[PDB]
Design an enzyme around this catalytic site. Structure first.
Site, PDB file in Angstrom:
ATOM      1  CD  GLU A   1      -2.777   1.340   2.383  1.00  0.00           C
ATOM      2  OE1 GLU A   1      -2.116   1.298   3.443  1.00  0.00           O
ATOM      3  OE2 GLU A   1      -3.990   1.642   2.353  1.00  0.00           O
TER       4      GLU A   1
ATOM      5  CD1 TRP B   1      -6.218   0.093  -0.343  1.00  0.00           C
ATOM      6  CD2 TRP B   1      -7.946   1.514  -0.269  1.00  0.00           C
ATOM      7  NE1 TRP B   1      -5.805   1.220   0.326  1.00  0.00           N
ATOM      8  CE2 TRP B   1      -6.846   2.108   0.383  1.00  0.00           C
ATOM      9  CE3 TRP B   1      -9.147   2.224  -0.350  1.00  0.00           C
ATOM     10  CZ2 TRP B   1      -6.914   3.379   0.953  1.00  0.00           C
ATOM     11  CZ3 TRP B   1      -9.211   3.489   0.217  1.00  0.00           C
ATOM     12  CH2 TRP B   1      -8.101   4.051   0.860  1.00  0.00           C
TER      13      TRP B   1
ATOM     14  CE1 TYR C   1      -5.051   8.995   3.232  1.00  0.00           C
ATOM     15  CE2 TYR C   1      -5.837   6.910   2.357  1.00  0.00           C
ATOM     16  CZ  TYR C   1      -5.845   7.873   3.345  1.00  0.00           C
ATOM     17  OH  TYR C   1      -6.650   7.714   4.448  1.00  0.00           O
TER      18      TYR C   1
ATOM     19  NE  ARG D   1      10.233  28.253  10.881  1.00  0.00           N
ATOM     20  CZ  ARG D   1      10.701  29.388  11.390  1.00  0.00           C
ATOM     21  NH1 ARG D   1      10.966  29.489  12.686  1.00  0.00           N
ATOM     22  NH2 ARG D   1      10.916  30.429  10.595  1.00  0.00           N
ATOM     23  NE  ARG D   2       6.581  28.775   5.442  1.00  0.00           N
ATOM     24  CZ  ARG D   2       6.873  29.769   4.606  1.00  0.00           C
ATOM     25  NH1 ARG D   2       6.929  29.557   3.296  1.00  0.00           N
ATOM     26  NH2 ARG D   2       7.111  30.984   5.083  1.00  0.00           N
TER      27      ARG D   2
ATOM     28  CB  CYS E   1      -8.100   7.845   7.405  1.00  0.00           C
ATOM     29  SG  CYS E   1      -8.462   7.488   9.127  1.00  0.00           S
TER      30      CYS E   1
ATOM     31  NE  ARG F   1     -11.044  11.545   7.718  1.00  0.00           N
ATOM     32  CZ  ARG F   1     -11.923  10.608   8.062  1.00  0.00           C
ATOM     33  NH1 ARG F   1     -12.458  10.607   9.278  1.00  0.00           N
ATOM     34  NH2 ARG F   1     -12.270   9.669   7.190  1.00  0.00           N
ATOM     35  CB  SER F   2     -11.103   8.808  11.844  1.00  0.00           C
ATOM     36  OG  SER F   2     -11.866   7.718  12.319  1.00  0.00           O
TER      37      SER F   2
ATOM     38  CG  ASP G   1     -10.631   0.197  14.021  1.00  0.00           C
ATOM     39  OD1 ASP G   1     -10.162  -0.285  15.074  1.00  0.00           O
ATOM     40  OD2 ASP G   1     -11.507  -0.386  13.346  1.00  0.00           O
TER      41      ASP G   1
ATOM     42  CG  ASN H   1      -3.174   4.106  10.019  1.00  0.00           C
ATOM     43  OD1 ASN H   1      -4.229   3.862  10.606  1.00  0.00           O
ATOM     44  ND2 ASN H   1      -3.119   4.337   8.710  1.00  0.00           N
TER      45      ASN H   1
ATOM     46  CG  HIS I   1     -12.903   5.237  17.206  1.00  0.00           C
ATOM     47  ND1 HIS I   1     -12.658   6.287  16.347  1.00  0.00           N
ATOM     48  CD2 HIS I   1     -13.027   4.136  16.428  1.00  0.00           C
ATOM     49  CE1 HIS I   1     -12.644   5.841  15.104  1.00  0.00           C
ATOM     50  NE2 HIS I   1     -12.865   4.540  15.125  1.00  0.00           N
TER      51      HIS I   1
HETATM   52  C1  LIG Z   1      -5.082   1.415   8.847  1.00  0.00           C
HETATM   53  C2  LIG Z   1      -5.277   0.988   7.744  1.00  0.00           C
HETATM   54  C3  LIG Z   1      -5.522   0.450   6.356  1.00  0.00           C
HETATM   55  N1  LIG Z   1      -6.834  -0.165   6.252  1.00  0.00           N
HETATM   56  C4  LIG Z   1      -7.937   0.671   5.798  1.00  0.00           C
HETATM   57  C5  LIG Z   1      -9.209   0.675   6.620  1.00  0.00           C
HETATM   58  C6  LIG Z   1     -10.403   0.999   5.982  1.00  0.00           C
HETATM   59  C7  LIG Z   1     -11.602   1.021   6.682  1.00  0.00           C
HETATM   60  C8  LIG Z   1     -11.610   0.716   8.036  1.00  0.00           C
HETATM   61  N2  LIG Z   1     -12.797   0.735   8.743  1.00  0.00           N
HETATM   62  C9  LIG Z   1     -12.799   0.431  10.090  1.00  0.00           C
HETATM   63  N3  LIG Z   1     -13.937   0.445  10.776  1.00  0.00           N
HETATM   64  N4  LIG Z   1     -11.616   0.110  10.728  1.00  0.00           N
HETATM   65  C10 LIG Z   1     -10.421   0.091  10.031  1.00  0.00           C
HETATM   66  O1  LIG Z   1      -9.359   0.186  10.645  1.00  0.00           O
HETATM   67  C11 LIG Z   1     -10.418   0.392   8.678  1.00  0.00           C
HETATM   68  C12 LIG Z   1      -9.214   0.375   7.977  1.00  0.00           C
HETATM   69  C13 LIG Z   1      -6.940  -1.554   6.560  1.00  0.00           C
HETATM   70  C14 LIG Z   1      -8.139  -2.257   6.480  1.00  0.00           C
HETATM   71  C15 LIG Z   1      -8.185  -3.611   6.810  1.00  0.00           C
HETATM   72  C16 LIG Z   1      -7.031  -4.272   7.215  1.00  0.00           C
HETATM   73  C17 LIG Z   1      -7.054  -5.736   7.553  1.00  0.00           C
HETATM   74  O2  LIG Z   1      -7.381  -6.575   6.600  1.00  0.00           O
HETATM   75  N5  LIG Z   1      -6.776  -6.165   8.785  1.00  0.00           N
HETATM   76  C18 LIG Z   1      -6.791  -7.589   9.088  1.00  0.00           C
HETATM   77  C19 LIG Z   1      -5.939  -8.351   8.070  1.00  0.00           C
HETATM   78  C20 LIG Z   1      -4.989  -9.355   8.715  1.00  0.00           C
HETATM   79  C21 LIG Z   1      -3.880  -9.715   7.746  1.00  0.00           C
HETATM   80  O3  LIG Z   1      -4.057 -10.584   6.863  1.00  0.00           O
HETATM   81  O4  LIG Z   1      -2.765  -9.151   7.817  1.00  0.00           O
HETATM   82  C22 LIG Z   1      -6.307  -7.885  10.478  1.00  0.00           C
HETATM   83  O5  LIG Z   1      -6.896  -8.742  11.174  1.00  0.00           O
HETATM   84  O6  LIG Z   1      -5.311  -7.296  10.954  1.00  0.00           O
HETATM   85  C23 LIG Z   1      -5.832  -3.576   7.276  1.00  0.00           C
HETATM   86  C24 LIG Z   1      -5.789  -2.226   6.956  1.00  0.00           C
HETATM   87  O1  LIG Z   2      -0.509  32.491  13.031  1.00  0.00           O
HETATM   88  C1  LIG Z   2       0.711  32.433  13.032  1.00  0.00           C
HETATM   89  C2  LIG Z   2       1.465  32.938  11.818  1.00  0.00           C
HETATM   90  C3  LIG Z   2       2.893  32.418  11.708  1.00  0.00           C
HETATM   91  N1  LIG Z   2       3.389  32.256  13.060  1.00  0.00           N
HETATM   92  C4  LIG Z   2       4.815  32.537  13.163  1.00  0.00           C
HETATM   93  C5  LIG Z   2       5.530  31.201  13.304  1.00  0.00           C
HETATM   94  C6  LIG Z   2       6.801  31.393  12.505  1.00  0.00           C
HETATM   95  O2  LIG Z   2       7.883  31.700  13.383  1.00  0.00           O
HETATM   96  C7  LIG Z   2       6.553  32.560  11.564  1.00  0.00           C
HETATM   97  C8  LIG Z   2       6.482  32.089  10.114  1.00  0.00           C
HETATM   98  O3  LIG Z   2       7.647  31.307   9.855  1.00  0.00           O
HETATM   99  P1  LIG Z   2       7.640  30.077   8.812  1.00  0.00           P
HETATM  100  O4  LIG Z   2       7.638  28.872   9.720  1.00  0.00           O
HETATM  101  O5  LIG Z   2       6.388  30.269   7.989  1.00  0.00           O
HETATM  102  O6  LIG Z   2       8.922  30.241   8.034  1.00  0.00           O
HETATM  103  O7  LIG Z   2       5.335  33.184  11.992  1.00  0.00           O
HETATM  104  C9  LIG Z   2       2.698  31.866  14.121  1.00  0.00           C
HETATM  105  O8  LIG Z   2       3.262  31.440  15.114  1.00  0.00           O
HETATM  106  N2  LIG Z   2       1.372  31.943  14.082  1.00  0.00           N
HETATM  107  O1  LIG Z   3      -5.898   4.676   7.740  1.00  0.00           O
HETATM  108  C1  LIG Z   3      -6.945   4.424   8.333  1.00  0.00           C
HETATM  109  C2  LIG Z   3      -8.154   4.431   7.649  1.00  0.00           C
HETATM  110  C3  LIG Z   3      -9.334   4.146   8.328  1.00  0.00           C
HETATM  111  N1  LIG Z   3      -9.303   3.861   9.664  1.00  0.00           N
HETATM  112  C4  LIG Z   3     -10.550   3.550  10.390  1.00  0.00           C
HETATM  113  C5  LIG Z   3     -10.939   4.667  11.347  1.00  0.00           C
HETATM  114  C6  LIG Z   3     -12.454   4.637  11.292  1.00  0.00           C
HETATM  115  O2  LIG Z   3     -12.971   3.834  12.329  1.00  0.00           O
HETATM  116  C7  LIG Z   3     -12.786   4.043   9.933  1.00  0.00           C
HETATM  117  C8  LIG Z   3     -13.183   5.125   8.937  1.00  0.00           C
HETATM  118  O3  LIG Z   3     -14.402   5.705   9.343  1.00  0.00           O
HETATM  119  P1  LIG Z   3     -14.615   7.301   9.267  1.00  0.00           P
HETATM  120  O4  LIG Z   3     -13.755   7.980  10.307  1.00  0.00           O
HETATM  121  O5  LIG Z   3     -14.235   7.803   7.894  1.00  0.00           O
HETATM  122  O6  LIG Z   3     -16.073   7.594   9.531  1.00  0.00           O
HETATM  123  O7  LIG Z   3     -11.626   3.366   9.487  1.00  0.00           O
HETATM  124  C9  LIG Z   3      -8.105   3.852  10.346  1.00  0.00           C
HETATM  125  O8  LIG Z   3      -8.090   3.589  11.549  1.00  0.00           O
HETATM  126  N2  LIG Z   3      -6.925   4.134   9.683  1.00  0.00           N
END
Ligand SMILES: C#CCN(Cc1ccc2[nH]c(N)nc(=O)c2c1)c1ccc(C(=O)N[C@@H](CCC(=O)O)C(=O)O)cc1
Ligand SMILES: O=C1CCN([C@H]2C[C@H](O)[C@@H](COP(=O)(O)O)O2)C(=O)N1
Ligand SMILES: O=c1ccn([C@H]2C[C@H](O)[C@@H](COP(=O)(O)O)O2)c(=O)[nH]1
Ligand SMILES: C#CCN(Cc1ccc2[nH]c(N)nc(=O)c2c1)c1ccc(C(=O)N[C@@H](CCC(=O)O)C(=O)O)cc1
Lengths: 263, 263
Positions: free
Chosen positions: A58, A80, A94, A126-127, A146, A166-167, A169, A177, A207
């Site tokens: 992946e 996937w 991604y 820092r960028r 995610c 952001r989320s 599992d 991850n 969660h």
């Molecule tokens: C993070 C991420 C990528 N993702 C993406 C992904 C997409 C939707 C999701 N949805 C939910 N609810 N949880 C997840 O973590 C999740 C993960 C993955 C999804 C599944 C497996 C998986 O098949 N796990 C099994 C497989 C075991 C194996 O053969 O290795 C496991 O039991 O571990 C791995 C990564």
């Molecule tokens: O809302 C803001 C604006 C930017 N800065 C500061 C942090 C950095 O020191 C500077 C921008 O520096 P760069 O990393 O972009 O090169 O401005 C900050 O701290 N908060």
């Molecule tokens: O890289 C990833 C992708 C997905 N998820 C899990 C988190 C969530 O439980 C679920 C996606 O649901 P939403 O957050 O999009 O609703 O899959 C992960 O943990 N890692």
């Protein structure tokens, strides 16, 4: 590992009931941060047997920029399969944003090459950032990114990386991850002739799913084993020329693999 | 505040001597997180006087989608003068992205409106994101976003928000960023009929400028005072109908201000 098990216990202690996008139920917290010093070893969970197989494909699939799951089908990766259309497309997820972020004025931005060049020429910037969160193409993606934002940081010759997820599992996705981005750091550090630093993981909605209690408790009852060590057996001349067989692990002796009902 | 001084303490005790874009020099750490319970009190620094005036006018200036500092001039707010051109323009910065992220096909996306509907119609959503990091237009901004993207979260009728700040001027910028986003939570929560929860601050390159060390040592020698209380005299029709006369801070008795140069 310690940080992982500690997170699971925090969810059990501070988590709130929160129905998800389907009505499965979770114990959820908001706002969490972990640090993995990659000098101590590769952060692959050991309280349950994991596998880098699907994580490597992946990641390489991400780096090629193709959002069609064809490559995964050829290599027997199935994470996937339940999100693609008949073509095998997922939208500009991604891979597309990493390599070809589309601009308004009809250009494309290869964020991976930008980061690599930044790390080589201007490591104090820092960028140094990659964002999969293209607000303008979220509606074209089979799934909202995610792990949608990460940043690199260089100091004392060590490459660090922070991810915002952001989320999360916790039981199912998080071990995947963490390992995925630790791999990326090693690959980026190697191509930049740098040592590895810290991987910082930051989560939004972190969660445990209600039907993962038995698996959670079983894993909590086990003691983390010593972290394994990553073995890159071949150095490519490009960040985009890595091969599946390039990666091995040594000293990985985990507890019995734990299996739950998947996603 | 306790969390703020602790981080300032952390940079001095673990920061790395880094050179930066401005040639000033900084002590730098990478990866940090802070939480502010907003029902405990409004997170406005007290160990040095901070002027809420400019903070309010800035946020109201963001929520209008405006990037010209002309509005900031009307109310004697000068924090963005060194970076604007003759016409007071900064380019497609925070405001432009919040209210009209430009898609590739030509449309525009209002992220503030989007989130406000997500919070009302689907508060369990784990993808309530506003992003200011528009990779396709960074080269047109007078300065890349520092508070680059944030996520909202709802649980137990409480509204929380987490910000990712890729770069943080701990002494000058952070007190403004914290107060700014905490103010947004109070405003979002008011328009969504929710209570205020936590503001979670996450930072990338967190640093203290070399010419701020004397001011830092002075501030660290002071004890935080009890946080004030934010009061909103009115309930505007929407998130964009807020006025500077609607806000009033009560109980803000800080230590004397500490002047320091801007880099
Ligand atoms: C993070 C991420 C990528 N993702 C993406 C992904 C997409 C939707 C999701 N949805 C939910 N609810 N949880 C997840 O973590 C999740 C993960 C993955 C999804 C599944 C497996 C998986 O098949 N796990 C099994 C497989 C075991 C194996 O053969 O290795 C496991 O039991 O571990 C791995 C990564
Ligand atoms: O809302 C803001 C604006 C930017 N800065 C500061 C942090 C950095 O020191 C500077 C921008 O520096 P760069 O990393 O972009 O090169 O401005 C900050 O701290 N908060
Ligand atoms: O890289 C990833 C992708 C997905 N998820 C899990 C988190 C969530 O439980 C679920 C996606 O649901 P939403 O957050 O999009 O609703 O899959 C992960 O943990 N890692
Ligand atoms: C973050 C942010 C917003 N910003 C934007 C902004 C832009 C570039 C930056 N560049 C650097 N190096 N540090 C900053 O924090 C910074 C901040 C601010 C900029 C200046 C002041 C400032 O001069 N503060 C003085 C008071 C001066 C006044 O307004 O009267 C102070 O008391 O500390 C505040 C906020």
């Amino acid at each position: 590992m310690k940080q992982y098990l500690e997170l699971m216990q925090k969810v059990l202690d501070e988590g709130t009931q929160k129905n998800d996008r389907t009505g499965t139920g979770t114990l959820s917290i908001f706002g969490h941060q972990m640090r993995f010093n990659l000098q101590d070893g590769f952060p692959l969970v050991t309280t349950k047997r994991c596998h880098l197989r699907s994580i490597i494909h992946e990641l390489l699939w991400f780096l090629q920029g193709d959002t069609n799951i064809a490559y995964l089908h050829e290599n027997n990766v199935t994470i996937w399969d339940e999100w693609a259309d008949e073509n095998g497309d997922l939208g500009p997820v991604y891979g597309k944003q990493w390599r070809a972020w589309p601009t308004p004025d009809g250009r494309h931005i290869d964020q991976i090459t930008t980061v690599l060049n930044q790390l080589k020429n201007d490591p104090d910037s820092r960028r140094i950032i990659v964002s999969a969160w293209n607000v303008g193409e979220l509606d074209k993606m089979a799934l909202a990114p995610c792990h949608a934002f990460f940043q690199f940081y260089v100091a004392d010759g060590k490459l660090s990386c922070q991810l915002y997820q952001r989320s999360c599992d916790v039981f199912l996705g998080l071990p995947f991850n963490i390992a995925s981005y630790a791999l990326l750091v090693h690959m980026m550090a190697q191509q930049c002739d740098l040592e590895v630093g810290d991987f910082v993981w930051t989560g939004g909605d972190t969660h445990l799913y209600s039907n993962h209690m038995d698996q959670t408790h079983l894993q909590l009852s086990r003691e983390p084993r010593p972290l394994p060590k990553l073995i890159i057996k071949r150095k490519p001349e490009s960040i985009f020329d890595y091969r599946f067989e390039d990666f091995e692990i040594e000293g990985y002796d985990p507890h019995p693999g734990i299996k739950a009902p998947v996603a």
